[PDB]
Design a protein around this motif. Structure first.
Motif, short mmCIF file in Angstrom:
data_model
loop_
_atom_site.label_atom_id
_atom_site.label_comp_id
_atom_site.label_asym_id
_atom_site.label_seq_id
_atom_site.Cartn_x
_atom_site.Cartn_y
_atom_site.Cartn_z
N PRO D 406 0.83 -1.21 0.00
CA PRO D 406 0.00 0.00 0.00
C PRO D 406 0.86 1.26 0.00
O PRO D 406 1.89 1.33 0.67
CB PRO D 406 -0.81 -0.12 1.29
CG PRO D 406 0.04 -0.97 2.18
CD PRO D 406 0.77 -1.93 1.29
N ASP D 407 0.42 2.25 -0.77
CA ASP D 407 1.12 3.52 -0.89
C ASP D 407 0.17 4.66 -0.55
O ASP D 407 -0.99 4.65 -0.97
CB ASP D 407 1.68 3.71 -2.30
CG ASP D 407 2.96 2.93 -2.53
OD1 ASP D 407 3.47 2.31 -1.57
OD2 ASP D 407 3.47 2.93 -3.68
N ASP D 408 0.67 5.63 0.21
CA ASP D 408 -0.12 6.79 0.60
C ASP D 408 0.07 7.90 -0.43
O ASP D 408 0.64 7.71 -1.50
CB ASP D 408 0.27 7.23 2.01
CG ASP D 408 -0.81 6.92 3.03
OD1 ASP D 408 -1.96 6.66 2.62
OD2 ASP D 408 -0.50 6.94 4.24
N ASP D 409 -0.41 9.10 -0.10
CA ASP D 409 -0.31 10.25 -0.98
C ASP D 409 0.02 11.49 -0.17
O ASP D 409 -0.36 11.60 1.00
CB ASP D 409 -1.60 10.46 -1.78
CG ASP D 409 -1.88 9.34 -2.76
OD1 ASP D 409 -0.99 9.02 -3.57
OD2 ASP D 409 -2.99 8.76 -2.70
N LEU D 410 0.72 12.43 -0.80
CA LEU D 410 1.11 13.66 -0.14
C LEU D 410 0.07 14.75 -0.36
O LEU D 410 -0.62 14.77 -1.38
CB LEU D 410 2.47 14.14 -0.66
CG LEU D 410 3.56 13.07 -0.81
CD1 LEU D 410 4.81 13.66 -1.43
CD2 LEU D 410 3.87 12.44 0.54
N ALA D 411 -0.04 15.65 0.61
CA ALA D 411 -1.00 16.75 0.54
C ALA D 411 -0.50 17.88 1.42
O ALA D 411 -0.33 17.68 2.63
CB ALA D 411 -2.39 16.29 0.97
N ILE D 412 -0.28 19.05 0.83
CA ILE D 412 0.20 20.19 1.60
C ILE D 412 -0.95 20.94 2.28
O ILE D 412 -0.71 21.69 3.23
CB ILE D 412 1.01 21.15 0.71
CG1 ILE D 412 1.99 21.97 1.55
CG2 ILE D 412 0.09 22.06 -0.09
CD1 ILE D 412 2.88 21.14 2.45
#
Lengths: 326, 425, 84, 651
Positions: D406-412
């Motif tokens: 599983p891979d997450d995602d970036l969010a500023i």
């Protein structure tokens, strides 16, 4: 509860309607007597009180009513400005209240035979609390039951919107800072709101679930006093977000926290509002046992004086005052 | 984040001000998996990311300028990459100074893509297959710039060289080895006659002197390969001698000490060579009460060239995850340039230093465990002859002390410039 | 609202013309079993809103109101509640 | 033509699916001949289902026992997804031998249950309690029931007649599930094992499992004695089987008085022999039906598997031959056409090509006419795909929901804090586990103490300690700006995610699958992990399957009109490709906009801006490209209305 060094009411003042909210001066709101403003159900009274422990020609307590006005729906919260002259030089009392009509009612007077009332469209839900979020007085932040904290001004426009994970219980303002605000949340995510740019600078996670109230120390910005579960917590920001100090207060669950407006080591709390007689516990830093206990028939209101370590508790049409030995 | 290192001498930053390789790996999701990279002397960094072989070069003063990543084409065939697949060509018998430091990137299908050099990448070789199977696991280099591919199901594929740019892939002469029939065969069948079941291959190592060793979970056979045929020398066993050393280094005085010394089930994994002998990485567990605790043993062979000997050193390795199949990448051993004075074994939470003698150009003894970082080590070894270690969210850190690089006086500097061939304007 | 509470109101209905009084009495009994005397007094004051044929609950509410009035200090309110 | 898709949703178990477990540390000691060593058959998984009565109202219904063999020990555990079992776990440490994949058999008699485990050189046999000896309750349907043994003394048995030395002439190759054990018509037991050098090693044993006068034979061509004698001779032709005549799997079927053992060699040859009546049956060549490709069968390879299925619903026998070569790979299904004269002919029912991947476990169901396989690649990843052979002549292979890495995602973000979102995503039970989080908290805290998982206050305190430690280790100035603190929190949470994935990938290696006859329930056995494959409804399986495969799937089964079917398929593909980004700030803003009075379009705009801020790649182009292919969404909106009826009280 607790019963270490207990005492009854020293100064008892009878009123008319039920007393549920009472506060003193936040910072520079008058340097001539204890200025208070209390509203029962359909009557709000401004009072100036002087005690015998502050002066000498006072027979116990002397209270003078300055303005009594009948309002519509009862209030549950009142905003206080940290820099307003009321009795020193030129009188200027501009304060807002969160009544039951879901709209804020702000009254502005100057003791010159005039008093302007304005209505501000706050939140459609039940407004919980509100307080000024500016050292000079130009913005008022309110929180209720809508998960959206909207920064309101003196006109009634939206300045900034903050998202919360729970209905806004209480709001705290730091007068000796730079637009520093706190919003108590049920989840425990306290955002050190810096209204200079309206951005989230720092966030703290209260690990004691559930979290009740929280506030700063009026003499130290690093000390943050909060109540959660059964013990009171002292946080040291921004060094550590985890509970730096955690000490019990009562045998049951507490209510709210209020730091002393005169010192930086003593404070007062209250467990359950009544049940087995309301015993307000005055505690000290690094002290698990209460250094003072005040007995009352019921608990409804807590505040700290800025001149002497004095606390006030409202009950059945009465107000009981206590003083700390420290 | 968190970082906890152990100093030994002079630990400094190999780059300059936080290299971008950490951010590149975090963006490419390469360091987010149990990696088993290779750090080859001169500054080469190899990463066998499933089917995307990443080969790059790092050196001193690198933060935002050294960030190129060269990829290698590799089709999908489920390769059992570990450490022997992307192995340098220093085990071959051809001397010179070109075909001794090549790059390996074979495909588990039947062919053997042999690179001529690594300083000028972009050239390959032409060699198709004729007989054999697939699913090649570990590659090894023998004399004559030829290769042998050994699968996990006992399948050997030989590389027959016909010229300098046209080779072929054939089966093993006189049939393959071990049990478990697979693919086509000729002449004799198998080679290891045992009443057990199969014979899972672990490693294949060809050393200088026409010596070849097929380390498997059964026996050890020595073949004198002449690039056309093999000759059986002697079938000996090393586990029967290593069990006593393992019991003496791990366990102590107990009641069933004789039974423990006679038992100890051993499973081989990694095996490489070095200028001071051989370095084997195998696991061992006592057949006592259930469940069994799999312990990692470090078998180091002390010598002066590349053959085998009797000076064996056995040590225990902490932090043991799980063991499965014949290609576990959690605990992998990688030798830098097969000619260093101290080897480095990287496990998911430690970097152990295998001492193979004194150090004249590289600082030895760098045993560093990890207690604050949960990310497994990507790779370890010697970079440009200096102990350089890669730490997640930290970059490359060098450990130097007395052995450095100064300025030669009179004729020494002139001779160095003459043998290095340098020019300027 | 809540059929779980509607059923508990219906099983108690049968002697009053307004189920609001019985519901208020049940919630007041629950609050008395829980605690909080201030909330108990508030609920007892709020319950007086809908009358019914069962005069016992009304008499109990009037007695509680008279007790609260004589404890707080409202002679006129106590006299009014007694004359009611 | 049969068109039916059977998609399955993954369900993490182990820690999420607890069970009353209790092992019995009783190491078994072999009493026969040993080998001292041998290949450690690690990551092996086998299963065996119990079928003693046709009624589905007893206690043994849907019961299956699975064994996990690692290195050289076994952890025999009995798991049931209906009735809880007490004392259903036992450890067996076999010395110098490893358990073969699929070599455990259970015989339930009227006195004691007899176990039979085939290892490398020593056969292990245990005697478990049973009625008329210790009273084991298997009647009626209850919540909890007893399983194997009771105390600690009935878990250690190494009798002389229980132990048995396993021969190998000239050897064996148990690469997969090929070890079979079955009784013949004369009452004698037969053990079939995949022997090397061509043929099958058949061990004949007296009745029951008591050790006595056993015999060994090698079924290669003709004359078992001659074959066993010539096995040591190097040969590789048609008359003399060798290395190119060894099957990966085995499947035997009881027929008349001659047990025909189906054997598929590497040169595309399916033959059958009888342990005591081997003869020249009929060398069936696969290339007689498969298109011409003699070079493939001449070069041979590895991965040739064979499966049989005698479907009694229509009384039809199907034979599935999976040919796997470095140049070709396909599953060929044939139907059996018997002649009632010991001669069987196959008719090419179907053939579906596939990619060149390592196949571990795979099978096919004739009730829905669908072959499903699970390719476990050596690149730290695995895929599973199913396809109907009687639907398309080529086959597109619809994949099943897989997520090993599983891979997450970036969010500023903008004004929120992604730290709470990352914490909630990590604490969500839909992925990872609590053990990985506990290990990460123990590690990142500079080696702290034991981290619990029962006290929420203590867990929050420990996670706050870890967050503050990471903050003061990364920077020191985090109170003068709003973006630096967010970036530091994002970096710390990425480090935490990497530390958790380093331990999750270790235990996320699927070994095999387990299916049970009657009542569809699929279990997935990984390296010390248990998972479930829950069957999803029609709309759920359509949403799970991408639109690229639904387009190849016939549109006459989904909707009535082809245009509406294509429209709903494009919409489903759009939803599936949008669902690739999952965070918590979007849900937070949605809840806030729903709690405060506004409008649904405001909530939609907030969710869209959150998805935009969280997105790293472009997806709107494909969304518009798939939405532009809409001409008649009548069937689409009809299928959408006739599926989401959940809150309407219609009954």
């Amino acid at each position: 509860m607790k019963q270490d060094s207990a005492s009854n009411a020293t100064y008892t003042v009878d009123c008319e309607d039920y007393v549920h909210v009472v506060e003193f001066n936040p910072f520079d709101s008058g340097e001539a007597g204890s200025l208070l403003a209390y509203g029962g159900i359909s009557y709000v009274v401004i009072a100036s009180c002087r005690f015998q422990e502050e002066d000498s020609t006072v027979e116990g307590i002397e209270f003078k009513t300055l303005k009594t006005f009948h309002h519509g729906e009862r209030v549950v919260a009142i905003a206080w400005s940290p820099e307003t002259r009321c009795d020193a030089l030129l009188p200027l009392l501009r304060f807002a209240t969160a009544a039951g009509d879901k709209k804020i009612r702000i009254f502005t007077s100057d003791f010159q035979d005039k008093n302007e009332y304005k209505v501000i469209e706050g939140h459609s839900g039940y407004i919980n609390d509100l307080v000024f979020c500016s050292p000079e007085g130009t913005d008022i932040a309110s929180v209720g039951d809508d998960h959206t904290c909207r920064i309101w001004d003196l006109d009634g426009k939206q300045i900034a919107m903050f998202i919360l994970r729970s209905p806004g219980m209480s709001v705290a303002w730091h007068p000796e800072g730079a637009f520093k605000l706190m919003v108590a949340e049920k989840t425990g995510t306290i955002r050190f709101y810096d209204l200079t740019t309206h951005q989230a600078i720092l966030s703290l996670e209260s690990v004691q679930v559930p979290l009740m109230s929280a506030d700063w120390c009026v003499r130290n910005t690093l000390r943050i006093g909060a109540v959660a579960g059964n013990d009171w917590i002292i946080w040291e920001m921004p060094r550590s977000s985890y509970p730096q100090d955690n000490k019990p207060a009562h045998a049951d669950r507490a209510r709210m926290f209020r730091w002393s407006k005169c010192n930086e080591n003593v404070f007062a709390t209250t467990g359950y509002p009544g049940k087995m007689k309301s015993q307000i516990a005055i505690h000290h830093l690094a002290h698990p046992q209460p250094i003072l206990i005040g007995t009352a028939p019921v608990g409804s209101g807590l505040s700290w004086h800025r001149r002497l370590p004095l606390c006030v508790v409202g009950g059945y049409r009465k107000l009981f005052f206590w003083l700390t030995e420290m | 984040p968190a970082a906890s290192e152990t100093v030994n001498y002079n630990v400094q930053l190999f780059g300059s001000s936080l290299p971008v390789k950490v951010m590149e790996a975090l963006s490419n999701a390469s360091a987010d998996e149990p990696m088993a990279a290779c750090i080859h002397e001169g500054g080469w960094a190899w990463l066998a990311c499933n089917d995307r072989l990443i080969i790059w070069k790092i050196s001193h003063s690198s933060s935002a300028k050294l960030m190129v990543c060269k990829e290698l084409p590799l089709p999908l065939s489920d390769s059992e990459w570990s450490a022997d697949l992307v192995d340098i060509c220093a085990q071959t018998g051809d001397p010179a100074a070109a075909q001794s430091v090549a790059l390996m990137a074979a495909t588990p299908e039947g062919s053997s893509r042999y690179w001529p050099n690594i300083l000028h990448e972009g050239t390959y070789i032409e060699s198709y297959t004729e007989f054999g199977s697939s699913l090649c696991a570990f590659v090894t280099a023998v004399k004559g710039n030829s290769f042998i591919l050994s699968s996990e199901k006992n399948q050997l594929v030989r590389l027959t060289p016909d010229a300098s740019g046209k080779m072929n892939q054939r089966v093993l002469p006189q049939g393959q080895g071990m049990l478990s029939g697979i693919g086509r065969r000729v002449s004799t069948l198998f080679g290891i006659l045992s009443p057990a079941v199969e014979s899972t291959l672990c490693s294949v190592l060809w050393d200088k002197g026409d010596c070849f060793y097929t380390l498997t979970d059964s026996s050890i056979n020595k073949w004198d390969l002449d690039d056309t045929s093999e000759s059986q020398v002697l079938n000996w066993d090393m586990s029967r001698v290593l069990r006593e050393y393992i019991s003496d280094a791990i366990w102590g005085s107990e009641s069933d000490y004789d039974d423990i010394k006679a038992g100890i089930n051993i499973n081989y994994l990694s095996l490489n060579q070095n200028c001071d002998g051989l370095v084997i990485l195998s696991a061992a567990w006592h057949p006592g009460d259930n469940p069994c605790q799999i312990y990692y043993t470090l078998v180091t062979v002390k010598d002066e060239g590349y053959n085998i000997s009797d000076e064996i050193t056995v040590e225990v390795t902490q932090f043991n995850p799980v063991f499965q199949a014949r290609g576990m990448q959690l605990c992998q051993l990688v030798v830098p340039n097969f000619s260093s004075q101290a080897c480095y074994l990287y496990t998911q939470e430690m970097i152990f230093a295998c001492s193979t003698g004194t150090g004249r150009s590289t600082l030895p003894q760098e045993k560093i465990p990890f207690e604050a970082q949960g990310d497994n080590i990507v790779g370890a070894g010697s970079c440009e002859g200096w102990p350089v270690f890669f730490i997640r969210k930290s970059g490359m850190l060098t450990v130097v002390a007395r052995e450095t690089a100064s300025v030669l006086p009179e004729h020494m500097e002139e001779s160095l410039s003459s043998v290095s061939k340098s020019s300027r304007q | 609202r809540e059929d779980f509470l509607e059923k508990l109101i219906r099983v108690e209905e049968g002697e009053s013309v307004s189920p609001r009084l019985q519901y208020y009495n049940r919630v007041l009994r629950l609050l008395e079993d829980v605690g909080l005397p201030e909330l108990v007094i508030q609920l007892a004051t709020i319950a007086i809103s809908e009358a019914s044929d069962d005069w016992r609950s009304q008499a109990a509410l009037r007695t509680r109101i008279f007790k609260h009035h004589l404890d707080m200090g409202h002679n006129s309110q106590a006299y009014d509640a007694l004359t009611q | 033509s049969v068109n039916l898709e059977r998609s399955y949703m993954e369900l993490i178990g182990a820690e999420r699916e607890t069970s009353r477990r209790n092992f019995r540390d009783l190491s078994l000691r072999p009493d026969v001949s040993l080998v001292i060593g041998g290949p450690k058959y690690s990551d092996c998984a086998g299963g065996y289902c119990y079928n003693e009565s046709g009624s589905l109202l007893s206690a043994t219904r849907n019961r299956f026992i699975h064994w996990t063999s690692y290195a050289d020990t076994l952890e025999l555990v009995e798991l049931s997804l209906d009735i809880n079992l007490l004392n259903n776990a036992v450890r067996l440490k076999i010395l110098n031998c490893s358990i073969l994949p699929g070599g455990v058999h259970i015989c339930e008699t009227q006195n004691n249950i007899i176990v039979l485990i085939l290892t490398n050189q020593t056969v292990h046999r245990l005697i478990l309690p049973h009625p008329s000896r210790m009273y084991r309750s298997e009647i009626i349907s209850d919540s909890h029931i007893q399983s194997i043994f009771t105390d600690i003394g009935k878990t250690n048995f190494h009798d002389p007649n229980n132990t048995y030395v396993i021969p190998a002439i000239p050897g064996r190759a148990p690469n997969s599930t090929a070890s079979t054990a079955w009784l013949s018509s004369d009452g004698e037991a037969l053990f079939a094992l995949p022997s090397v050098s061509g043929g099958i090693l058949v061990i004949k044993m007296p009745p029951r499992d008591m050790e006595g006068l056993v015999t060994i034979a090698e079924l290669k061509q003709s004359s078992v004695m001659q074959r066993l004698l010539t096995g040591w001779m190097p040969s590789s032709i048609r008359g003399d089987p060798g290395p190119a005549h060894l099957p990966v799997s085995l499947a035997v079927h009881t027929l008349d008085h001659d047990s025909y053992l189906f054997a598929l060699c590497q040169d595309h040859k399916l033959r059958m022999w009888s342990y005591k009546d081997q003869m020249c049956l009929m060398v069936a060549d696969m290339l007689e039906y498969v298109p011409v490709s003699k070079d493939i069968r001449q070069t041979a390879g590895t991965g040739h598997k064979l499966r049989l299925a005698y479907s009694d619903t229509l009384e039809i026998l199907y034979l599935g031959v999976y040919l796997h070569t470095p140049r070709q790979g396909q599953f060929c299904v044939f139907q059996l056409v018997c002649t009632e004269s010991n001669r069987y002919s196959l008719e090419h029912t179907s053939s579906i090509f596939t990619n060149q991947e390592t196949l571990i476990d795979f099978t096919f169901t004739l009730s829905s006419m669908n072959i499903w396989a699970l390719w476990l690649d050596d690149d730290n990843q695995t895929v599973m795909k199913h396809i109907n052979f009687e639907r398309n002549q080529a086959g597109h292979w619809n994949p099943v929901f897989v997520n090993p890495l599983p891979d997450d995602d970036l969010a500023i973000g903008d004004e929120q804090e992604p730290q709470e979102a990352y914490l909630e995503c990590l604490f969500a039970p839909g992925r990872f586990t609590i053990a990985a989080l506990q290990k990460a908290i123990q590690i990142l805290r500079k080696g702290s103490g034991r981290v619990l998982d029962l006290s929420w206050e203590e867990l929050k305190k420990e996670v706050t300690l870890t967050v503050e430690k990471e903050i003061q280790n990364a920077v020191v100035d985090y109170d003068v700006s709003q973006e630096e603190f967010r970036q530091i929190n994002i970096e710390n949470w990425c480090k935490f995610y990497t530390c958790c994935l380093q331990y999750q990938e270790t235990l996320s290696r699927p070994l095999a699958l387990v299916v049970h006859p009657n009542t569809n329930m699929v279990c997935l056995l990984r390296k010390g992990f248990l998972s479930f494959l829950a069957p999803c409804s029609s709309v759920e399986h359509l949403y799970l399957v991408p639109g690229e495969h639904l387009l190849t799937v016939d549109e006459s089964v989904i909707c009535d009109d082809v245009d509406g079917a294509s429209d709903i398929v494009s919409l489903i593909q759009c939803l599936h490709m949008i669902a690739d980004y999952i965070t918590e700030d979007m849900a937070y803003q949605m809840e806030s906009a729903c709690c405060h009075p506004q409008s649904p379009e405001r909530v939609a705009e907030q969710i869209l801006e959150d998805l935009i801020a969280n997105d790293i790649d472009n997806i709107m182009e494909n969304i518009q490209n798939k939405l532009q292919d809409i001409r008649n969404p009548i069937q689409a909106i009809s299928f959408l209305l006739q599926n989401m009826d959940y809150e309407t009280n219609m009954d």
